[PDB]
Amino acid sequence: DQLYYECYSDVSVHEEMIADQVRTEAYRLGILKNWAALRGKTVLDVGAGTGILSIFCAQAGARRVYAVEASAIWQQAREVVRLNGLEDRVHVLPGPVETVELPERVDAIVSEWMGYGLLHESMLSSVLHARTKWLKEGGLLLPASAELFVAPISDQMLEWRLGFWSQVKQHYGVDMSCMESFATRCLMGHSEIVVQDLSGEDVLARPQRFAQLELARAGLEQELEAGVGGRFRCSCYGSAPLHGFAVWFQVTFPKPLVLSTSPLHPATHWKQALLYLNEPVPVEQDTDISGEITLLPSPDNPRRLRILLRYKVGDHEEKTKDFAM
Amino acid sequence: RTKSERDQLYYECYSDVSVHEEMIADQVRTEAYRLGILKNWAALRGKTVLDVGAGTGILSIFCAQAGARRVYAVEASAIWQQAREVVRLNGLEDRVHVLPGPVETVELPERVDAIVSEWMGYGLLHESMLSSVLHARTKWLKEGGLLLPASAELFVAPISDQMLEWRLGFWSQVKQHYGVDMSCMESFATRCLMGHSEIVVQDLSGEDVLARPQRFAQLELARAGLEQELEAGVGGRFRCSCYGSAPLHGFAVWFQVTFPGGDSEKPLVLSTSPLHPATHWKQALLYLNEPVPVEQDTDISGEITLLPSPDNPRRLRILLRYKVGDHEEKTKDFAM
Numbered sequence: 001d002q003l004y005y006e007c008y009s010d011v012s013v014h015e016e017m018i019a020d021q022v023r024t025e026a027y028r029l030g031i032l033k034n035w036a037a038l039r040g041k042t043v044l045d046v047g048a049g050t051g052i053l054s055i056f057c058a059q060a061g062a063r064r065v066y067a068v069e070a071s072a073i074w075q076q077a078r079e080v081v082r083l084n085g086l087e088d089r090v091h092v093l094p095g096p097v098e099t100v101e102l103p104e105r106v107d108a109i110v111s112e113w114m115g116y117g118l119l120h121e122s123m124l125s126s127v128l129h130a131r132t133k134w135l136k137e138g139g140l141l142l143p144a145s146a147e148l149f150v151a152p153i154s155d156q157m158l159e160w161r162l163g164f165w166s167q168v169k170q171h172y173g174v175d176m177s178c179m180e181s182f183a184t185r186c187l188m189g190h191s192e193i194v195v196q197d198l199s200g201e202d203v204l205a206r207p208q209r210f211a212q213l214e215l216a217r218a219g220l221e222q223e224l225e226a227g228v229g230g231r232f233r234c235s236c237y238g239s240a241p242l243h244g245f246a247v248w249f250q251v252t253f254p255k256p257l258v259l260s261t262s263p264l265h266p267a268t269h270w271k272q273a274l275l276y277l278n279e280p281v282p283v284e285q286d287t288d289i290s291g292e293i294t295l296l297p298s299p300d301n302p303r304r305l306r307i308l309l310r311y312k313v314g315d316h317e318e319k320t321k322d323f324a325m
Numbered sequence: 326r327t328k329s330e331r332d333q334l335y336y337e338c339y340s341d342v343s344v345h346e347e348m349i350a351d352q353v354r355t356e357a358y359r360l361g362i363l364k365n366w367a368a369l370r371g372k373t374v375l376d377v378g379a380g381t382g383i384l385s386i387f388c389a390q391a392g393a394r395r396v397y398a399v400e401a402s403a404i405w406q407q408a409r410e411v412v413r414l415n416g417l418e419d420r421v422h423v424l425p426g427p428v429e430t431v432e433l434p435e436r437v438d439a440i441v442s443e444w445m446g447y448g449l450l451h452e453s454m455l456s457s458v459l460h461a462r463t464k465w466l467k468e469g470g471l472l473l474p475a476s477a478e479l480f481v482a483p484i485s486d487q488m489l490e491w492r493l494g495f496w497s498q499v500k501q502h503y504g505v506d507m508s509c510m511e512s513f514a515t516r517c518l519m520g521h522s523e524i525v526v527q528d529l530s531g532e533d534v535l536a537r538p539q540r541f542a543q544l545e546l547a548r549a550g551l552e553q554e555l556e557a558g559v560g561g562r563f564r565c566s567c568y569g570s571a572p573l574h575g576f577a578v579w580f581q582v583t584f585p586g587g588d589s590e591k592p593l594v595l596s597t598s599p600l601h602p603a604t605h606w607k608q609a610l611l612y613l614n615e616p617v618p619v620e621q622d623t624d625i626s627g628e629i630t631l632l633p634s635p636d637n638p639r640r641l642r643i644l645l646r647y648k649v650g651d652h653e654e655k656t657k658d659f660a661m
């Protein structure tokens with residue numbers, strides 16, 4: 001745990017998260033749009049960082065915010081709260097949320113806990129521990145749920161990198177087309193999850209929701225250990241080389257506001273989690289693709305995301321690939 | 326990591342496509358070698374060439390296209406098998422010979438007329454590949470032979486880094502967009518972003534340059550005894566006067582290499598300066614612990630030494646000694 005917390009003692013990660021305008025505006029609005037449910041109520045900010053989300057909760061009308069932060073950045077949060085004149089009702093409490101002592105259970109929890117592929121970092125378990133210990137019955141969760149999506153992809157950037165070697169002749173007068181098979185093995189033949197941003201034109205079929213996480217659900221923490229995911233089925237839009245699948249998520253706040261990391265929506269720092277096949281597979285309009293995706297903690301490191309992929313393209317035999325972040 | 330582990334990582338890196346894609350996609354770099362080689366056709370026609378660390382073989386092929394009779398393309402990582410295919414694909418395997426393994430233990434049939442190599446790393450000497458080129462020169466280059474490029478030059482300039490300024494000022498600008506005052510974090514951000522002792526590789530522009538760049542070292546690859554200068558430290562002293570008022574953030578170090586042949590007084594130069602087109606080498610930034618205000622005609626002097634790290638000969642270390650105006654001389658010790 002200590003190694004993890006120390007990653008957040010440096011300014012850069014916090015600058016990156018606030019500079020993610022889609023992320024930060026969405027949390028801001030998700031909180032402020034809940035003013036009626038927060039007015040005069042108490043809030044626990046799990047992993048409060050610099051404190052910015054706790055101050056949004058105060059602007060929404062919370063009577064008190066407990067801002068709990070395990071890394072050294074809590075000292076900066078204390079100063080931010082003081083600078084904004086909110087030390088009377090926003091209280092920064094250092095340490096893990098699992099052992100912090102609050103004066104009272106709270107009406108609401110706010111937290112930005114999502115990692116790459118949703119569950120990389122595994123910070124959800126700390127939010128669920130706080131829910132069990134400190135959230136009043138039926139309390140407000142900001143956000144309250146996460147939804148997981150998959151779509152087959154033809155990655156235009158990958159195509160360009162594989163095709164790069166056949167363009168060397170035009171650039172420098174040396175033919176290097178024979179490098180394409182080697183490049184394919186290098187860029188696709190591995191078993192790592194690739195975090196990369198796609199565009200709408202990389203999506204080869206209607207995205208499918210394959211799992212939903214309800215943060216209030218008691219027993220969710222046990223589900224995370226066993227893996228979360230599910231089956232999916234789709235049919236391709238048209239002819240292209242299938243490179244694999246993109247996985248992304250959205251979270252929904254108590255119309256409810258949705259923060260999405262879909263390639264069809266404005267870019268975020270999460271991008272998408274790309275699962276490449278070992279080599280491209282030609283697909284056509286109406287080619288059926290079915291499969292199953294499971295998000296699991298790595299055996300060597302619970303905080304490291306693993307994804308089991310099972311898939312069937314058209315008539316081909318079912319195949320499997322086991323990815324890790 | 327142990328030496329065994331460092332060697333394995335190096336092998337894995339250059340056995341993989343990504344680094345070679347980056348180098349070849351670096352058009353300034355690759356065009357400079359193509360033209361610099363072709364401009365030496367008169368010295369290369371009918372002669373033999375050793376390409377130290379040939380990679381995919383593209384530079385060896387440039388040498389064949391310039392008229393070389395025979396090219397030995399020596400490559401230690403698994404990419405040598407890709408280079409063999411590339412050479413065959415272009416119909417050149419009967420005089421471009423891809424040879425696997427370290428140049429330090431390869432066997433050639435004779436000493437060669439010329440050596441070509443793209444050996445430069447970040448801050449010129451990060452990765453420390455020059456030593457292999459010099460080993461090949463001593464062992465395989467004929468007396469009075471040709472080196473391509475023939476020399477490298479190191480430059481320094483004081484900088485006011487506009488990107489760093491933006492990152493340091495980020496916290497003071499949060500409130501005007503999100504309604505939360507975070508100005509109090511500027512000191513913390515400064516400690517995090519400047520108080521470290523890491524060399525930062527980043528692209529600068531001419532706007533960031535606070536004074537006329539100063540050349541502070543030159544490496545003549547033909548010089549016997551250059552290998553001994555590498556271990557003792559490469560560098561030199563500098564002085565400059567600031568263009569105007571701005572916060573001094575530290576210094577940028579960059580290099581160029583010069584190809585022989587052509588105009589004896591205007592050789593072909595591959596530059597990584599912020600004043601010239603971008604390359605994958607960017608520049609090596611040496612940040613002071615905190616910004617220092619300077620004015621027009623503020624004098625800045627000091628000394629810069631590039632050394633291999635004691636824990637890892639492939640890891641660049643830079644010792645900076647510097648004096649700003651009337652302030653006392655200061656020192657800072659950076660590592661890549």
Ligand SMILES: NC(=[NH2+])NCCC[C@H]1O[C@@H](n2cnc3c(N)ncnc32)[C@H](O)[C@@H]1O
Nearest residue numbers: 008047069070071096097112113114115126
């Ligand atoms: N969205 C993410 N991928 N990560 C969000 C991390 C936000 C903050 O939560 C802090 N943090 C993480 N786990 C804990 C914990 N159990 N208790 C308290 N603070 C924590 C961490 O130090 C950081 O400052």
Ligand SMILES: NC(=[NH2+])NCCC[C@H]1O[C@@H](n2cnc3c(N)ncnc32)[C@H](O)[C@@H]1O
Nearest residue numbers: 339378400401402427428443444445446457
């Ligand atoms: N400009 C740089 N910063 N590095 C250029 C490295 C180019 C190629 O030289 C190869 N290489 C490195 N050292 C050696 C050596 N001693 N002998 C042979 N090949 C080598 C390495 O495997 C790579 O494929």
